[PDB]
Design a protein around this ligand. Structure first.
Ligand SMILES: CCCCCCCCCCCCCCCCC[C@H](O)OC[C@@H](COP(=O)([O-])OCC[N+](C)(C)C)O[C@@H](O)CCCCCCCCCCCCCCC
Ligand SMILES: CCCCCCCCCCCCCCCCCCCC(=O)O[C@H](COC(=O)CCCCCCCCCCCCCC)COP(=O)(O)OCCN
Ligand SMILES: CCCCCCCCCCCCCCCCCCCC(=O)O[C@H](COC(=O)CCCCCCCCCCCCCC)COP(=O)(O)OCCN
Ligand SMILES: CCCCCCCCCCCCCCCCCCCC(=O)O[C@H](COC(=O)CCCCCCCCCCCCCC)COP(=O)(O)OCCN
Ligand SMILES: CC(C)CCC[C@@H](C)[C@H]1CC[C@H]2[C@@H]3CC=C4C[C@@H](OC(=O)CCC(=O)O)CC[C@]4(C)[C@H]3CC[C@]12C
Ligand SMILES: CC(C)CCC[C@@H](C)[C@H]1CC[C@H]2[C@@H]3CC=C4C[C@@H](OC(=O)CCC(=O)O)CC[C@]4(C)[C@H]3CC[C@]12C
Ligand SMILES: *C(=O)CC[C@H](NC(=O)CCCCCCCCCCCCCCC)C(=O)O
Ligand SMILES: CCCCCCCCCCCCCCCC(=O)O
Ligand SMILES: CCCCCCCCCCCCCCCC(=O)O
Ligand SMILES: CCCCCCCCCCCCCCCC(=O)O
Ligand SMILES: CCCCCCCCCCCCCCCC(=O)O
Ligand SMILES: CCCCCCCCCCCCCCCC(=O)O
Ligand SMILES: CCCCCCCCCCCCCCCC(=O)O
Ligand SMILES: CCCCCCCCCCCCCCCC(=O)O
Ligand SMILES: CCCCCCCCCCCCCCCC(=O)O
Ligand SMILES: *[C@@H]1O[C@H](CO)[C@@H](O)[C@H](O)[C@H]1NC(C)=O
Ligand SMILES: *[C@@H]1O[C@H](CO)[C@@H](O)[C@H](O)[C@H]1NC(C)=O
Lengths: 55, 371, 128, 339, 227, 37
């Protein structure tokens, strides 16, 4: 249990020292991506049977 | 008329048989005078003591004569047969022989509308049941496949029976003419009736091959069931029609007096008796499994009777346990009310048990309703 | 993250009493069946006792029946084990083990050597 | 003792990570998307029903052409379907019937599968004779194969019940890189769009972001209460969604390094078996043990529609590359295409 | 060339569907079994009597059986055990507190939502090893199972003629330990078939055949709402 | 005469066809009066 613990602490140090942006900023990029590709999403807006290969 | 020729032959048969019987029996021995033996136009009477009313069954010469009723002939105390007061001639009493009394007609029309309603209710429930098994493909299996064919026999047999009882039975003009078109409907009625009974045997063979013998199975071939249910009933129906068209060619083949009918009913009675032995083997196997799980004796009986009760309409067991109408008048009336209900509502019973009350069917259609 | 932290234990004379506590966090405590497991020195993990979600169904291993009492408090998100009449064979590291899935009758893998939903344990030593 | 020092040393770091994540949580996603219009009622209909599998289906994967798809059933068969005409293109008998995953190569020339045999088998679809045959058997995992995804015709990443993920060289058949760190069975993986990173979900209620080139774990995501059964990247590669046995779906952001949204409801008490995003990422589709698939509004955490045309546990689902249709596999041995 | 393109697809789909009919008959003819047991339960010797998973094939009365045993898989079973929800039966081998661990595993298998419709064939193995320990009397079952000291041999028991009541009561108590779990739930969808077995017994394969016949027979009776 | 249960429907049909019904009896009713035997 000693050797497994040295790697757990060493891994936690790598994940601790990372650059984190604000959640409001992160939520803004996800919202901006959906609106930018909203017209390109057939599941969000169903196309007529002429463009639907399954019909 | 052909039935007239049939009626005259039986009279001539009994006339010569009575002429020979009167020569066989010796003279009577009694202190008081005895009415001498004689043959009236229809029946044979032996030497009768004076002041005695003699009873005898009614003959079978005419359709309006009921062979269950009694013929009476009175011998006067002076030793002479009773004479009718109007004409003063030797007279036998045949007034009770009438089979179409207002009371007997009322009992028959009750059975008549019992058949029309039973087959109507059967068609409605079996068409819906057959549609459920056809449209819901998830229910599909070998058991459902045989049920579909079993359902169709009940549907076609019920439709033809309604046509026969509505378009042929009431129309006396059509029957008196005796066309080939009503003998055609009889061949189809008999074929679909025999197909119906032999598909009950197909269901029994398949279920007895699941529960009792070759339990692992999974290799059953429907081909032999299709040939037994749809194909073989053509053998006795064709043999019967040939002998009927040759030997007993009555109006629209409606008579049940000829023994040629046992060409079809004989085999179907043997097929349902086999279904009875399948039932006993399946209930016995079932009982041993309730004993292996140590089921209570009270819960063992209510589930064995239930399993027996739901297999009776499927296998046609009612035809085997009550295969003979009693001679007694009161018992015959109860037999008619019981057997006609079980016969004409059998298709409705099968559709209600094996489709409507089936747990696999219910959860399948209930999920689609919520969908 | 799911965290189970046991407390209590230590050195106790043979025949004494001991009460263990398991503070849970990171999950809906009331939705999970809880377990107590222990690992004797040199031996493998073994199941001790469990308790249902509402605390109605309670089971014990045969060696501790009549001596151990398990209980839970869903309001405080805590699991308890009242150890009475302790014997030297009871010396082991006792672990608080949660069943893997909520709203389940079965409880798999709680005695596995690498089970994730299990605390770090508390040492109980019964010796004179 | 020495164990207490290292165990407490790890405890101090978890507080530092939790405190750093709390500092970035100034506002939640539910508040930023409070003013956007809802997607309304999403009514999708079954357009195709793919029949032919004998036993329960465990996995499926769309081809990059958005027309062909491969499905894996525990009867020991890989079937490649033409979703347009429902015709079967290939029927591949498997050596081991206990297959738990399948993958379609992006080039369309290969498919992969694996399961309780602990082997990822590669099948060549473009054989000269015209009969699909095994091209490579990738052994080395000490546990069942749970997921596999092609990086290209020569590289594939696998996840296994041995708590590890591995990168394979198909030509050599050796593990180029082994990804360790999970403490439970890894159940699913999802490649980033640029194939530079990938995320994995495991039975330790945690998800980890891995670097393919370096082989190390960049970030570890927590928040689920039970085993994570499914994972899928957001189309931009900056977020991912997970489905767990805790009857919830969660959205995690890489740059924020924390959960952003939880997709749950009081009626749902069954685990999630599969997750996938729509083309724009606005819709989050999820398969459930209750035989139904729920369409969630990924931005507003509201349920938008239900795909309830299955009679058994939904085991897998996938959205085409062009976003035109969604395929659902289930334990009822049928695959359905929804539009 | 639109017609010729779709024509070859229908012809290729025809050859596939023809092959799938032959595989369907074989798949439905074979009965699949999952063999579970501890490391020292004795299941390895039973495989000898006849990789992540091992396969064993044997035929009894023209019936094919496909038995599977887990190989290189971790002791965490809650995920991979779901693959065996459609097997004919689970063969659970138990060495007659290792016994308590088998009871807990049996309880999880019996109560798992995906294994609710799966019957279990229970092999109470090591019956000759169990007999020797009871005749000696050094190790008492009452220490690990306190309710055994008040246990009484059932009336329906059928022990061997050459067997003392100490061994008969001991083996039947272990059987009731598992039967209490099996009869507590199920509501008649699956059943437990316990057998006092030995690793060298030749009736083991016949016992699996008889239980599978009983399993299939009750499955047919359930489809007709007869039982 | 077919007396089995499988002949019950036919017996009802054969009885009703000989009753007068709509167009009259198939055969003339039997006279059982003083003039007859
Ligand atoms: C509750 C949900 C399910 C509902 C299911 C319903 C199924 C159908 C029920 C129909 C009920 C009405 C039947 C009417 C029969 C014809 C009417 C006609 O006037 O005859 C009346 C009666 C007496 O006739 P008569 O006066 O001798 O004629 C003399 C004729 N002359 C004048 C020519 C001589 O008919 C008799 O035959 C009585 C028997 C009627 C038929 C059976 C009725 C019971 C059906 C039970 C169905 C059970 C279904 C259960 C479903 C849950
Ligand atoms: C629809 C209305 C009619 C429904 C009719 C249902 C009939 C069956 C329902 C009851 C079934 C259980 C009882 C059967 C009768 C008694 C059998 C003998 C006594 C008995 O139990 O014998 C056992 C051994 O099996 C034996 O000795 C052989 C048992 C063989 C049973 C065969 C059953 C055939 C049923 C056929 C039905 C046909 C219906 C036709 C309309 C040993 O018992 P024990 O000594 O351990 O304990 C006895 C405690 N009292
Ligand atoms: C739950 C609702 C649905 C069901 C409703 C049931 C209603 C029950 C009550 C009404 C039953 C129908 C009406 C009575 C019919 C009686 C038929 C038998 C009596 C009888 O006449 O016996 C012989 C004919 O049957 C024979 O030749 C013997 C019978 C054939 C036996 C075949 C093997 C049966 C095995 C045992 C099964 C269980 C039977 C009891 C259910 C002799 O005829 P005859 O012309 O000399 O008569 C002269 C006058 N009596
Ligand atoms: C979907 C929900 C679940 C559904 C489950 C199944 C439900 C089944 C329902 C029953 C279907 C079959 C029975 C048909 C109706 C009953 C017929 C009884 C006899 C009958 O004709 O009744 C009256 C005559 O009765 C009499 O003169 C006395 C007759 C006494 C003996 C009756 C024996 C009946 C045996 C069969 C019963 C079967 C029950 C189901 C197993 C009618 O004549 P009327 O009133 O005009 O007469 C006036 C005289 N003055
Ligand atoms: C009312 C009168 C005119 C009916 C005369 C008999 C025939 C015109 C029909 C009636 C019912 C038919 C049967 C209804 C159902 C079937 C099952 C069918 O096989 C299946 O359903 C298996 C799957 C398939 O092949 O579709 C083969 C034909 C057959 C025997 C049919 C053969 C032709 C039959 C005997
Ligand atoms: C009153 C008249 C119009 C009745 C005419 C009835 C015929 C149309 C029926 C009677 C027998 C039937 C046959 C009975 C049995 C079979 C075998 C059956 O075989 C299978 O379906 C194979 C099943 C398998 O083995 O897997 C195909 C239909 C067929 C030829 C049936 C075709 C329709 C037939 C000739
Ligand atoms: C003799 O004196 C009377 C004979 C007969 N009188 C009638 O009242 C005949 C009754 C009419 C029968 C109608 C039944 C048809 C129903 C079939 C289908 C019903 C349900 C199916 C749903 C799909 C006469 O004609 O004189
Ligand atoms: C399971 C319940 C179904 C109820 C269905 C109700 C209607 C069924 C059809 C009834 C037909 C009755 C025909 C009567 C004919 C007559 O009296 O002459
Ligand atoms: C479903 C049953 C239909 C029964 C139809 C019976 C009448 C049509 C079949 C016979 C047609 C040829 C004989 C017609 C009568 C005649 O010869 O004048
Ligand atoms: C048109 C066909 C004429 C000849 C018919 C002969 C009689 C039927 C033969 C096949 C009977 C099959 C009975 C079931 C057998 C089984 O289920 O194994
Ligand atoms: C299904 C085939 C038979 C259908 C019914 C056919 C009826 C034919 C007409 C009645 C029989 C006439 C006499 C035929 C034999 C003879 O010439 O003596
Ligand atoms: C299984 C085959 C059965 C065949 C049955 C054939 C019956 C033929 C009967 C011929 C009539 C015998 C009695 C004389 C009747 C008459 O007078 O016409
Ligand atoms: C399946 C078992 C029975 C098979 C044989 C059935 C024999 C039926 C015999 C009928 C004889 C009819 C004699 C002439 C009767 C008449 O027309 O008056
Ligand atoms: C399953 C077998 C059914 C048998 C049905 C038999 C019906 C009764 C047959 C005889 C009726 C009485 C007349 C007999 C005349 C004679 O034997 O010569
Ligand atoms: C003219 C003869 C008519 C005979 C009618 C009854 C036929 C009964 C057939 C029963 C078949 C039973 C087969 C048992 C063996 C099996 O299929 O496994
Ligand atoms: C009745 O028969 C006897 C024969 O012994 C005969 O002597 C007598 O005259 C007969 N009487 C009548 C009225 O025929
Ligand atoms: C004939 O029989 C009937 C019925 O039994 C009876 O009422 C009548 O008195 C008998 N005699 C005559 C001459 O009708």
């Amino acid at each position: 249990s000693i050797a497994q613990a040295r790697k757990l602490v060493e891994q936690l140090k790598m994940e601790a020292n990372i650059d984190r942006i604000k959640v409001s900023k992160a939520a803004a990029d996800l919202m901006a991506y959906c609106e930018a590709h909203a017209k390109e999403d057939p599941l969000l807006t169903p196309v007529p049977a002429s463009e639907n290969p399954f019909r | 008329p052909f039935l007239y020729v049939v009626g005259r032959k039986k009279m001539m048969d009994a006339q010569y048989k009575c002429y020979d019987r009167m020569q066989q029996l010796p003279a009577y021995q009694g202190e008081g005078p005895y009415c001498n033996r004689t043959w009236d136009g229809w029946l044979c009477w032996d030497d009768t003591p004076a002041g005695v009313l003699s009873y005898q069954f009614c003959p079978d010469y005419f359709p309006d004569f009921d062979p269950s009723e009694k013929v009476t002939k009175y011998c006067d105390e002076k030793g002479v047969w009773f004479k009718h007061p109007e004409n003063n001639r030797t007279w036998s009493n045949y007034t009770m022989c009438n089979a179409f009394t207002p009371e007997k007609l009322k009992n028959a029309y009750v059975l008549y509308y019992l058949a029309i309603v039973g087959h109507s209710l059967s068609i409605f429930t079996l068409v819906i049941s057959l549609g459920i098994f056809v449209f819901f493909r998830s229910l599909g299996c070998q058991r459902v496949t045989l049920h579909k064919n079993m359902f169709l026999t009940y549907i076609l047999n019920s439709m033809i029976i309604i046509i026969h009882l509505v378009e042929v039975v009431p129309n006396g003009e059509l029957v008196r003419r005796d066309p080939v078109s009503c003998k055609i409907l009889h061949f189809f009625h008999q074929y679909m009736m025999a197909c119906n009974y032999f598909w009950m045997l197909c269901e029994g063979i398949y279920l007895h091959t699941l529960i009792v013998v070759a339990v692992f199975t999974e290799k059953q071939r429907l081909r032999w069931y299709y040939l037994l249910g749809w194909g073989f009933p053509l053998v006795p129906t064709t043999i019967h029609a040939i002998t009927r068209a040759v030997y007993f060619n009555d109006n629209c083949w409606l008579s049940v007096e000829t023994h040629l009918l046992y060409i079809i009913h004989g085999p179907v009675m043997a097929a349902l008796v086999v279904n009875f032995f399948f039932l006993l083997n399946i209930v016995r196997v079932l009982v041993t499994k309730m004993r292996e799980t140590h089921e209570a004796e009270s819960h063992m009986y209510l589930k064995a009777v239930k399993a027996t009760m739901i297999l009776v309409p499927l296998l046609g067991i009612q035809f085997v346990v009550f295969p003979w109408r009693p001679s007694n008048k009161m018992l015959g009336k109860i037999y008619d009310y019981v057997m006609h209900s079980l016969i004409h509502f059998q298709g409705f019973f099968v559709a209600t048990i094996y489709c409507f009350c089936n747990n696999e069917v219910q959860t399948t259609v209930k999920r689609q309703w919520a969908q | 993250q799911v965290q189970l932290q046991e407390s209590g234990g230590g050195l106790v004379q043979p025949g004494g009493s001991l009460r263990l506590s398991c503070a849970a966090s990171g999950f809906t405590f009331s939705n999970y069946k809880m377990n107590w497991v222990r690992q004797a020195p040199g031996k493998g993990l073994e199941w001790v006792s469990d308790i249902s979600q509402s605390g109605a169904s309670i089971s014990y291993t045969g060696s501790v029946k009549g001596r151990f009492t398990i209980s839970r408090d869903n309001a405080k998100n805590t699991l308890y084990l009242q150890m009475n009449s302790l014997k030297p064979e009871d010396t082991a590291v006792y672990y608080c083990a949660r069943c893997p899935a909520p709203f389940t009758r079965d409880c798999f893998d709680v005695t596995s050597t690498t089970y994730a939903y299990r605390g770090q344990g508390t040492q109980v030593t019964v010796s004179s | 003792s020495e164990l207490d020092q290292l165990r407490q040393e790890a405890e101090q770091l978890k507080n530092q990570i939790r405190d750093a994540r709390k500092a970035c949580a100034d506002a939640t996603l539910s508040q930023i998307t409070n003013n956007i219009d809802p997607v309304g009622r999403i009514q999708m209909r079954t357009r195709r029903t793919l029949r032919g599998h004998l036993a329960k289906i465990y996995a499926m994967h769309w081809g990059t052409d958005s027309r062909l798809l491969v499905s894996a059933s525990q009867d020991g068969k890989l079937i490649i379907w033409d979703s347009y005409t429902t015709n079967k293109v290939h029927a591949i008998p498997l050596r081991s019937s206990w297959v738990m995953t399948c993958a379609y190569a992006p080039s369309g020339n290969y498919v992969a599968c694996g399961g309780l045999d602990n082997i990822c088998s590669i099948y060549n679809l473009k054989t000269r004779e015209g009969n699909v045959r095994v091209s490579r058997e990738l052994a080395g995992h000490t546990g069942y194969l749970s997921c596999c995804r092609f990086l290209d015709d020569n590289q594939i990443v696998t996840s296994s019940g041995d708590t590890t993920c591995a990168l394979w060289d198909i030509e050599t058949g050796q593990q180029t890189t082994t990804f360790t760190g999970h403490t439970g069975d890894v159940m699913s993986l999802s490649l980033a769009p640029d194939t530079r990173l990938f995320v994995s979900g495991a039975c330790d209620a945690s998800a980890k972001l891995w670097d393919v080139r370096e082989g190390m774990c960049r970030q570890t995501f927590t928040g689920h209460e039970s085993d994570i059964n499914a994972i899928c990247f957001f189309p931009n590669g900056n977020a991912f969604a997970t489905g767990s046995d805790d009857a919830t779906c969660r959205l995690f952001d890489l740059r924020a390094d924390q959960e952003l949204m939880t997709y749950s409801h009081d009626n749902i008490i069954c685990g999630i078996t599969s997750v996938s995003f729509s083309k724009s990422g606005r819709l989050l589709l999820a398969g459930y043990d209750d035989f139904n698939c729920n369409v969630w509004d990924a931005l507003k955490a509201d349920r938008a529609g239900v795909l309830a045309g299955h009679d058994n546990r939904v085991s897998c689902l996938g959205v085409t590359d062009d976003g035109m249709a969604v395929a659902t596999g289930s334990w009822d041995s049928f695959l359905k295409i929804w539009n | 060339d639109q017609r010729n393109e779709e024509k070859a697809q229908r012809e290729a789909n025809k050859k596939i569907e023809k092959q799938l009919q032959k595989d369907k008959q074989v798949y439905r003819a074979t009965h699949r079994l999952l063999l579970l047991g501890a490391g020292e339960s004795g299941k390895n010797t039973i495989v000898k009597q006849m990789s992540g998973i091992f396969e064993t094939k044997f035929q009894v009365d023209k019936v094919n059986f496909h038995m599977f045993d887990v190989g290189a898989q971790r002791d965490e079973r809650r995920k991979w055990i779901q693959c065996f929800n459609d097997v004919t039966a689970i063969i659970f081998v138990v060495a007659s507190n290792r016994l308590q661990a088998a009871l807990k595993l049996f309880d999880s298998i019996w109560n798992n939502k995906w294994l609710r419709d799966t019957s279990v064939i229970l092999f109470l193995n090591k019956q000759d090893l169990l007999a020797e320990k009871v005749l000696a009397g050094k190790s008492k079952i009452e220490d690990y199972f306190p309710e055994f000291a008040r246990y009484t041999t059932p009336e329906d028991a059928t022990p061997e003629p050459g067997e003392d009541p100490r061994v008969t009561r001991a083996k039947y108590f272990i059987r009731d330990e598992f039967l209490r779990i099996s009869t507590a739930s199920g509501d008649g969808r699956h059943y437990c078939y316990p057998h006092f077995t030995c690793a060298v017994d030749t009736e083991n394969i016949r016992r699996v055949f008889n239980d599978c016949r009983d399993i299939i027979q009750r499955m047919h009776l359930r489809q007709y709402e007869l039982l | 005469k077919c007396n089995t249960a499988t002949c019950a429907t036919q017996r009802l049909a054969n009885f009703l066809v000989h009753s007068s019904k709509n167009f009259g009896p198939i055969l003339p009713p039997t006279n059982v009066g003083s003039n007859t035997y």
